[PDB]
Design a binder for this molecule. Sequence first.
Ligand SMILES: CCOc1cc([C@@H](Nc2ccc3c(N)nccc3c2)C(=O)NS(=O)(=O)c2ccccc2)ccc1OC(C)C
Ligand SMILES: [Ca+2]
Lengths: 55, 254
Amino acid sequence: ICVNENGGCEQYCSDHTGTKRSCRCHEGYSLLADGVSCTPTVEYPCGKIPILEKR
Amino acid sequence: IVGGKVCPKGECPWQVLLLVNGAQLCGGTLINTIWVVSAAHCFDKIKNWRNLIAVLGEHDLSEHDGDEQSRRVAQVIIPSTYVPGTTNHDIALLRLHQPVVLTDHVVPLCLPERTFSERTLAFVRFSLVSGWGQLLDRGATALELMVLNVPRLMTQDCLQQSRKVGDSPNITEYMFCAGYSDGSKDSCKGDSGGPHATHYRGTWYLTGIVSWGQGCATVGHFGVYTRVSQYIEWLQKLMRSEPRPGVLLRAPFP
Ligand SMILES: CCOc1cc([C@@H](Nc2ccc3c(N)nccc3c2)C(=O)NS(=O)(=O)c2ccccc2)ccc1OC(C)C
Ligand SMILES: [Ca+2]
């Protein structure tokens, strides 16, 4: 599932037992209940531009 | 950077400037508060490892605006497979002596997982390359941080679209081509070590390192970048390791 469209994950994807898939996030983010989206948990998460984010 | 634009202050907050005895050496990329990724070739001619400084939050080299943060480089880690004066395995992992403080102007770039980088990021066509390098081939370097959007090529395509050259190095699986063959846009020697950053679903990731090429923005030639995805596990393991005496460390690769 992960090979195709990142398994629908916003960030990281892990394939499991058959047709099971778990999305994961980089440190400084947590996975939302949709099981795909990553939301920041810190003030300055990696790969985000504060002057653009605050605009 | 040839044919780019000024990166608006704070829009490349992971960009690092490396200095040796106060002189511009190379660029780098901040990946967390204490680690910077740069190019191994940046260190081929260092004699005094104690005067190596990393500057975060830099934008304009002519003025101090208070957003700059300087740190001594405590360790420079290079893969055992890199050979000074050659092009393969062009990567270095730098440990700062004290962490930088994250601010609106100093933010790390995400070091992605290998699978995500190979399966997804490697297929994003355009990415940004940045630095204070030459504005033209045989021209002056930039006072303000410059940025350029470049498309990535599959290596078979790069070799097919390029003009044949004598003693030209091979493009290995530890590299990738990006840029243009028309001589208008490229990264340059002063941008060495800087980021090739890729956007995916609202977040930026480190995919390449400004590594080499044949003359800046030379017709028939593309820029060559270190393929960071080959080094994720190597980088991760080193970041979990305790510091060792001596600035330079050669670490086994893989
Ligand atoms: C592994 C790096 O190899 C080379 C690095 C470089 C110079 N960097 C770059 C980086 C990106 C380039 C781009 N995108 N487009 C055009 C040109 C680009 C040149 C460099 O840094 N020059 S340097 O004189 O400062 C130096 C070189 C080597 C070691 C230490 C210092 C030119 C040739 C190189 O190798 C040969 C092909 C064999
Ligand atoms: Ca400045």
